[PDB]
């Protein structure tokens, strides 16, 4: 993450991020809504950071430092550029909605009133089709990636040294290779939880309640489609084992 955004989302809640004199101007129900929206954006920032660890620290480091066989790095990090593009774009839209909502003279005091429309856009049309295609592919390659990682770590000294080197810093404690893969697979199933709780605190404007209801249904449609489109790939699986599925 970049420092501006890290600082903007350093606090444990929206109510602790904003100035206390600003907080005091709002009703409790608005504070509750804003706290959950803040969690959505904060966790999206962290998800994009997970993807940057995967692309920049691991994938690109392996290509630059190690002599792995063709196709190995793609097998460890399936679809990571596509995933980075999807979520970096989504993050950009969330952060621009925040920035537009800032009070003049402030870099921290805002209220987001119109999130539902942004979520409808993300989870419909071409962007939703791309999310579905990319997660169906990634999640079907998940087992294969973990098994390839374990094999290389156990057998290739320079690979082991590389991993131990770049994962030594304390700030990588939660973000080894396998941990990053599972964080990414689990991201998509976080969205209904977050959206439903935003919706619980968004009844004051009926247009907003309606838009978040529509968004929640689109997100669940995406997840159902991804779930039905997964079949785990296995290195060395024979045709007979597949057609006897």
């Amino acid at each position: 993450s970049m420092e501006m955004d890290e600082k903007d989302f350093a606090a444990d809640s929206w109510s602790l991020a904003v100035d206390s004199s600003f907080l005091q101007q709002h009703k409790k129900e608005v504070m509750k809504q804003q706290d959950v929206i803040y969690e959505l954006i904060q966790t999206e920032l962290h998800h994009v950071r997970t993807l940057k660890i995967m692309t920049r620290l691991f994938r690109t480091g392996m290509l630059e430092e190690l002599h792995l066989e063709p196709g190995v790095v793609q097998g460890l990090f399936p679809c990571v550029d596509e995933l980075s593009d999807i979520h970096t774009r989504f993050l950009s839209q969330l952060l621009e909605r925040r920035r537009q909502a800032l009070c003049p003279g402030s870099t921290r005091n805002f209220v987001i009133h119109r999130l539902g429309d942004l979520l409808i856009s993300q989870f419909s049309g071409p962007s939703a089709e791309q999310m579905c295609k990319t997660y169906s592919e990634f999640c079907s390659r998940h087992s294969k990636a973990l098994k390839l990682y374990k094999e290389l770590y156990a057998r290739d000294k320079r690979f082991q040294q590389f991993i131990r080197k770049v994962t030594r810093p304390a700030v990588l404690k939660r973000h080894g290779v396998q941990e990053c893969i599972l964080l990414v697979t689990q991201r998509i199933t976080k969205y209904p939880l977050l959206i439903s709780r935003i919706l619980q605190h968004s009844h004051g404007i009926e247009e907003e309640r309606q838009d978040l209801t529509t968004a929640l249904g689109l997100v669940k449609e995406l997840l159902s489609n991804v779930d039905e489109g997964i079949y785990q790939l296995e290195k060395g699986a024979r045709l007979q084992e597949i057609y006897n599925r």
Binding site: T189, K190, S224, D227
Partner: protein, 179 residues
């Protein structure tokens, strides 16, 4: 410090996410309780042994039978959770959660955890359950379920008060270390 992996499973109502949050902060949040849990690596020393225990939630995956099993690879210990305020959450343990965990995590120890133990003697809880001809889960009902499902053990805790939470994770660490 050796690395081990913990996964928590159970119904949405079981309080799994809250349990992970409270353990990882050593604190019930005073201002905002998070909706979601990403992951965490806890430094635990149990019986003189140092472990890095990676923590994972399955919240949000309960409806998605092909996504959810992606959480299970290389698990060292399972927390299988129900809420003491929800007999329904206990009834779902033996024939929904247990066969899935035994399939994807063979020979992995299971600790059955009764969450929300503070609500066993809560008057609101008792009134609400009585209307469905129910009452809070009794300790013997918890133990008997754990026995039946082949659990490593049975434990209770309260994320709200923090009572019992440390002990659950220390025991999970011990279970993960067993050969």
């Amino acid at each position: 410090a050796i690395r081990k992996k913990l996964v928590i499973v159970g119904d949405g109502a079981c309080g799994k996410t809250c349990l992970l949050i409270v353990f990882s902060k050593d604190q019930f949040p005073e201002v905002y309780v998070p909706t979601v849990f990403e992951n965490y690596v806890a430094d635990i020393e149990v019986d003189g042994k140092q472990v890095e225990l990676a923590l994972w939630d399955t919240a949000g995956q309960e409806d998605y039978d092909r996504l959810r099993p992606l959480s299970y690879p290389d698990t060292d210990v399972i927390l299988m959770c129900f809420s003491i305020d929800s007999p329904d959450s206990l009834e779902n343990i033996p024939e929904k959660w247990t066969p899935e965990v035994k399939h994807f995590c063979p020979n992995v120890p299971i600790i059955l955890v009764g969450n929300k133990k503070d609500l066993r003697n809560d008057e609101h809880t008792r009134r609400e359950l009585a209307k469905m001809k129910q009452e809070p889960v009794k300790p013997e009902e918890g133990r008997d379920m754990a026995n039946r499902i082949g659990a490593f053990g049975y434990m209770e805790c309260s994320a709200k008060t923090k009572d019992g939470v440390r002990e659950v994770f220390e025991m999970a660490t011990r279970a993960a270390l067993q050969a």
